[PDB]
Design a protein around this ligand. Structure first.
Ligand code: PC7
Ligand code: PTY
Lengths: 66, 93, 70, 80, 96, 487, 96, 51, 76, 75
């Protein structure tokens, strides 16, 4: 029983390509949900104006020019 | 038998060296190389001292470090442009 | 059995000898030619082009003209 | 509502940036008493409630303005 | 409960300079009173729904697992979630 | 007053004394050889103490006339670059002597004599400041190493490996010698300090640089010529491999640092992408080929090519982080790699085999060896707190500043380096025992425990406080970074 | 007192792994448990002192890597964020 | 230890049962006590003092 | 087994239980205590507190670098 | 478990796999131990007493006290 030449590296119900297709579908679920989130456009539906800080949006306290 | 204390180096450009034809007087060339290395190390240590100043300004001030350490941060970043053998920004010494 | 030396096996020893005597095992087939002409002739060229172009783009960002790397 | 907390007193209390908003004057005593009570969640209630009410007032005052601006946007488009 | 006030309170100085949040992207105040009370109760409703589903599938059920023995898609769907979304199998074969 | 003359004469006296001693007195030969090696090591350590670290001038300079008109002469001197190489090459010899302590009765006096002549020849290589004599001692190492490989080889393959190594070294050597001759004829002399102040015409820089690269790249195997190293390394005694990997692989990089990076500053810049390309693929290819090797000594021998090709990325970066951090890697590699071959030598001396298949479960029978083997496995895979990480990280920060892409490719070296380094340890040490193959064991003896001690101490001392070594080099490596530059 | 927080587990490991043959299966457990527990109580004082007392401590032992400007010394930084992780990590480690 | 059909079940010691019951009772009492204090707040029926 | 009783390991081996582990355990504590003293003394010397504490903290008993770096403009 | 004396009177296996010498005798040293131990002692003595006593000559010290001097002369 001579040993194999590649005798140094040695989910049975699925194949590599079929399981890759399943993984691609699973990740396409995330991609489609992201596209739906883009389509929702939640940015234009914000219920409050952007917060405005005093002293010119705290320019001096944030490192701005004195 | 070297004298006790820190090393002493003459801080002056070696006379006889001309940038027009550097490969003219070999001794002035090596002296100039050593001298230039010495001032580049001086610049490096000055940048390190400024870095220490910024380091202890960030910790002592705290939240107010944006307005109190602005003066030091810009000095340190101005002094780190011409450090030496670093990024492609090389000083014209 | 008063010896520390291994009881070497014929199968393992022959397999190791075959794996170490692979120098004389080419047939110069299309697989070897394509393999050595791609992963030994093209990947180095691709990498060299990568570093050369990285240097070129570093040079152009600072405004200095390109350096003659030849 | 006009600012009461000036710049030098906010820096002395070391109020975190972003919390130096319109209601910062009420935040200084609240932060003083939080430290003196080890940040316990049941000791400083009178100070906390005033600051929370001020913050709620700011949030309501901004949402009302945003509602007005959206009403103005919706009025112009459909009345073209 | 003890650390709720010091860490996620409004304007707390517990963190001091450890954490920096820029004034522009600060939405902690609106997180409390800017949203309908339904949003603050979604996790509880979903937790109750999940608990009810788990009880109805485990403690008392007809055990319709015969679907897993007659539906080819159900068996493959069961294998997909069980085998870590087919990461170990696919990643091994295609990279390692 | 300790100078370079006594350090070089000590191995001479050691080899002469054993030359005229009867072979029946086996004890006296071993004692005198070990004493000579230890005295040389202490001499080097003393030379470290009195080393000035504020001047770029060569220190402890000594001169001896060679040609009648003083055109070429024996100029010996050390600087911040070659001091640690001298210390390492004097420290490795006593370990090599101690390796063959038990079986020395069969080798005889010709073993210690060969190793002492080796030490004599390698000390002068790192100390020569003359281009021609650096070549003379550069290629004088072949004879002792040829004898070591052939006379005391393992199997009959020793004839082939010695021939192959000798042929490669010769073909590099003469193509370098032609360039050395052309430099001598044009300039007039071969003194390094004079050759560093002579302007070379731009056309002659490329040819001379290529000719120098031909000889150096063989001894720092880049890509086309790393086929002699595995065979000659495996067909070598346990102490023979320590010399080949510990020091003989450091000639190419030292030759680049001393005679290439300075004498041609313009040529070095033009060929920088070429060296980056060869080193990047060598790191990727060799660290990947290592996974599919089955010989214990052929896996570690492939761990040196990846590490030594990571050094040539550091040297050609031409900054303090790069050049300065590349020196620490070679000192670290000279200790980590040479310690790994001691671990393999321990396994081979007891069980006369090297295939990884026969080894397994040694954690339950040789625990001290497993603890020591694991520690050097961590060092080989660039763990922080070890001397390898300091050199490995300093090279990366020295190359990222010059080219982000080459620092990215070289960063995958530690990805693959950590793969086979631990995977080998799992096979050899961890697992179940195989009583069918091998059943008698013996853990490390007194010699093996004591031999590994300086490696253990010298690996963390450089790994947690490398400031001792670094501060002795910055004055010397900074003058190396800029030579043609004047701004 | 702050170096003890970091180095007590190291000393316990260095004792229980180098001289475990003299302590056995009980002494080796006692050494590590006692060292980690003392580190945990020291982390409790560190929390009372830095997080609640609002006085961070900065401790530098020696320079580790000193290139031209690649300075990464052996420095320890205890601020509000660090102390929370201390009282979590060390307490969980002592309980484990 | 009670045997029904060969198999026996060792009765747990008093310390374990008492501790488990006490901890569970403490959890329930704490949940109800918290629901008494700020239960209306999370329901949105009443702000603490905001309005 | 029978051969693992003939193997010397630093950790002690399988099911190690020396006859005098009580005495050895007491010595190990005392050794750890003796090496922890210089570490504590070293820590109290190299530690820096730029900010005065809100309330008297125990570290003021031994540490002396409280409010020292307030003049950061003259740092090295 | 925590009170019963142990059974292993002495640690299993000899240290460095060397049998203890004859009673009332001593481990006879090998021919290499004494030179190696005196070498290892002299190495520690030279490095600890030499590196810590050599003057702090460096380019990160002279340059430091030159930069610290020119940094204040600019004011
Ligand atoms: C270098 C920087 C990072 C340092 C990380 C250190 C992490 C530990 C590294 C070594 C761990 C040992 C792994 C290799 C040996 C595998 C296990 C072994 O055989 O070791 C022996 C020896 O025991 C040890 O593991 C000692 C090594 C670890 C203890 C020393 C560590 C000291 C602290 C770590 C270093 C301090 C500084 C770290 C920070 C830089 C234990 O044998 P037993 O448990 O009794 O079972 C074996 C069966 N039979 C007895 C039959 C043989
Ligand atoms: C029984 C062992 C079992 C296994 C043990 C595992 C390892 C445990 C021991 C770890 C190694 C400890 C080494 C010390 C590392 C931390 C201290 C760094 C050394 C240090 O800071 O001092 C510098 C050198 O002095 C010195 O102290 C130098 C003395 C060091 C002697 C080391 C001898 C190693 C021999 C290696 C020979 C080969 C060398 C490599 C070629 C001087 O500091 P400074 O420069 O700032 O001066 C300032 C003057 N104002």
């Amino acid at each position: 029983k001579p040993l194999s030449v590649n005798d140094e590296l040695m989910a049975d119900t699925v194949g590599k390509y079929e399981a890759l297709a399943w993984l691609s579908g699973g990740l396409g679920f995330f991609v489609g949900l992201g596209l739906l989130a883009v389509l929702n456009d939640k940015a234009s539906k914000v219920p409050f104006t952007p917060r405005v800080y005093p002293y010119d949006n705290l320019r001096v306290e944030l490192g701005g020019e004195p | 038998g070297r004298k006790k204390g820190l090393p002493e180096f003459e801080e002056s450009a070696p006379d006889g060296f001309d940038p027009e034809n550097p490969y003219k007087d070999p001794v002035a060339m090596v002296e100039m190389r050593e001298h230039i290395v010495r001032e580049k190390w001086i610049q490096i240590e000055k940048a390190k001292i400024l870095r220490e100043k910024v380091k202890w300004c960030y910790r002592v001030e705290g939240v107010n470090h944006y307005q109190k350490c602005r003066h030091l941060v810009q000095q340190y970043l101005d002094s780190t442009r011409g450090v030496g053998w670093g990024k492609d920004h090389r000083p014209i010494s | 059995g008063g010896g520390m030396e291994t009881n070497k096996n014929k199968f393992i020893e022959d397999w190791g000898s075959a794996r170490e005597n692979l120098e004389h095992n080419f047939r110069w087939t299309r697989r070897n030619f394509a393999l050595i002409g791609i992963f030994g002739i093209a990947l180095p060229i691709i990498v060299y082009k990568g570093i050369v172009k990285d240097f070129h783009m570093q040079d152009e960002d600072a405004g200095r003209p390109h350096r003659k790397f030849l | 509502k006009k600012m009461i907390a000036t710049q030098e007193e906010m820096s002395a209390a070391k109020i975190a940036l972003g919390s130096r908003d319109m209601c910062a004057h009420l935040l200084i005593p609240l932060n003083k008493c939080r430290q003196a009570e080890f940040y316990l969640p049941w000791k400083c209630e009178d100070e906390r409630h005033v600051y929370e009410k001020c913050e709620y007032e700011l949030v309501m005052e901004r949402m009302l303005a945003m509602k007005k601006i959206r009403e103005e946007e919706a009025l112009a488009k459909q009345n073209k | 409960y003890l650390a709720k006030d010091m860490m996620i309170g409004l304007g707390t100085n517990f963190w001091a300079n450890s954490l920096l949040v820029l004034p522009k992207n600060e939405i902690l105040a609106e997180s409390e009173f800017a949203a309908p009370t339904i949003i603050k109760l979604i996790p509880i409703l979903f937790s109750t729904l999940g608990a009810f589903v788990a009880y109805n599938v485990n403690l008392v059920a007809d055990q319709f697992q015969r679907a897993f023995q007659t539906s080819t898609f159900c068996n493959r769907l069961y294998s997909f979630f069980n085998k870590r979304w087919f990461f170990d199998q696919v990643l091994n074969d295609f990279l390692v | 007053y300790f100078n370079l003359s006594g350090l070089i004469l000590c191995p001479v006296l050691g080899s002469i004394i054993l030359l005229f001693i009867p072979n029946s007195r086996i004890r006296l030969i071993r004692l005198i050889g070990l004493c000579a090696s230890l005295i040389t090591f202490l001499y080097s350590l003393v030379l470290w103490i009195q080393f000035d670290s504020s001047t770029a001038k060569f220190q402890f300079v000594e001169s001896l006339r060679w040609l009648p008109y003083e055109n070429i002469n024996f100029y010996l001197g050390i600087d911040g670059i070659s001091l640690f190489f001298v210390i390492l090459t004097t420290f490795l010899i006593p370990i090599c002597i101690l390796v063959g302590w038990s079986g020395m009765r069969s080798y005889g006096k010709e073993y210690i004599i060969a190793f002492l002549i080796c030490e004599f020849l390698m000390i002068a290589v790192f100390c020569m400041l003359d281009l021609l004599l650096f070549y003379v001692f550069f290629e004088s190492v072949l004879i002792p190493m040829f004898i070591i490989i052939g006379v005391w080889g393992s199997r009959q393959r020793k004839i082939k490996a010695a021939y192959q190594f000798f042929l490669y070294t010769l073909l590099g050597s003469l193509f370098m010698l032609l360039a050395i001759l052309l430099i001598l004829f044009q300039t007039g002399t071969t003194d390094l300090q004079i050759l560093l102040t002579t302007e070379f015409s731009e056309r002659r820089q490329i040819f001379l640089w290529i000719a120098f690269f031909a000889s150096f790249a063989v001894k720092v195997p880049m890509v086309p010529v790393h086929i002699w190293l595995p065979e000659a390394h495996v067909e070598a005694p346990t102490a023979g491999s320590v010399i080949l990997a510990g020091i003989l692989l450091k000639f190419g990089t030292y030759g680049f640092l001393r005679f290439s990076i300075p004498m041609f500053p313009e040529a070095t810049l033009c060929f920088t992408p070429f060296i980056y390309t060869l080193s990047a693929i060598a790191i990727i290819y060799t660290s990947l080929t290592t996974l599919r090797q089955i010989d214990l000594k052929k896996i570690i021998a492939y761990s040196s090519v990846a590490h030594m090709n990571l050094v040539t990325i550091g040297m050609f970066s031409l900054n303090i982080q790069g050049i300065g951090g590349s020196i620490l890697l070679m000192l670290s590699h000279g200790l980590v790699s040479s310690a790994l071959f001691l671990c393999v030598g321990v396994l081979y001396d007891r069980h006369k085999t090297r295939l990884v298949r026969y080894y397994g479960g040694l954690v339950s029978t040789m625990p001290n060896f497993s603890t020591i083997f694991f520690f050097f496995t961590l060092a080989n895979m660039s763990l922080p707190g070890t001397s390898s990480f300091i050199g490995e990280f300093l090279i990366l920060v020295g190359a990222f500043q010059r080219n982000s892409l080459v620092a990215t490719l070289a960063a995958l070296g530690m990805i693959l380096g950590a793969a086979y380094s631990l995977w080998l340890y799992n096979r050899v040490v961890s697992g179940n025992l195989k009583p069918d193959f091998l059943h008698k064991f013996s853990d490390l003896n007194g010699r093996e425990v004591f031999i590994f001690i300086p490696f253990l101490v010298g690996l963390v001392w450089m790994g947690v406080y490398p400031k001792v070594f670094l501060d002795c080099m910055h004055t010397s490596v900074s003058n190396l970074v800029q030579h043609g530059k004047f701004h | 007192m702050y170096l003890l927080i970091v180095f007590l587990p190291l000393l316990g490991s260095s004792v229980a792994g180098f001289f475990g043959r003299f302590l056995g299966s009980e002494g080796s457990a006692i050494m590590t448990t006692t060292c980690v527990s003392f580190s945990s109580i020291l982390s409790l004082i560190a929390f009372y002192e830095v997080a609640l007392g609002a006085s961070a401590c900065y401790l530098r032992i020696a320079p580790w890597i000193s290139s031209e400007m690649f300075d990464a010394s052996w420095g320890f930084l205890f601020d509000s964020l660090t102390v929370v992780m201390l009282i979590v990590v060390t307490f969980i480690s002592s309980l484990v | 230890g009670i045997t029904y059909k060969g198999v026996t079940v060792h009765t747990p010691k008093t310390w374990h049962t008492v501790t488990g019951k006490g901890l569970c009772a403490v959890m329930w009492f704490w949940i109800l006590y918290r629901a008494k204090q700020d239960g209306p707040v999370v329901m949105g029926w009443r702000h603490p003092w905001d309005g | 087994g029978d051969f693992r009783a003939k193997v010397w390991s630093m950790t002690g081996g399988p099911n190690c239980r020396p006859k005098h582990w009580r005495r050895n355990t007491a010595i190990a504590m005392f050794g750890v205590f003796l090496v922890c003293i210089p570490i504590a003394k070293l820590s109290a010397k190299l530690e820096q507190r730029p900010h005065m504490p809100v309330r008297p903290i125990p570290s003021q008993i031994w540490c002396k670098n409280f409010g020292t770096k307030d003049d950061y403009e003259k740092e090295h | 478990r925590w009170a019963t004396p142990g059974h292993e009177e002495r640690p299993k296996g000899y240290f460095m796999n060397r049998t203890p010498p004859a009673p009332g005798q001593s481990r006879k040293w090998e021919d290499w131990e004494l030179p190696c131990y005196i070498t290892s002692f002299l190495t520690i003595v030279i490095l600890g007493v030499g590196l810590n006593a050599k003057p702090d000559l460096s380019i990160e010290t002279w340059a430091h006290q030159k930069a610290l001097e020119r940094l204040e002369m600019e004011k």
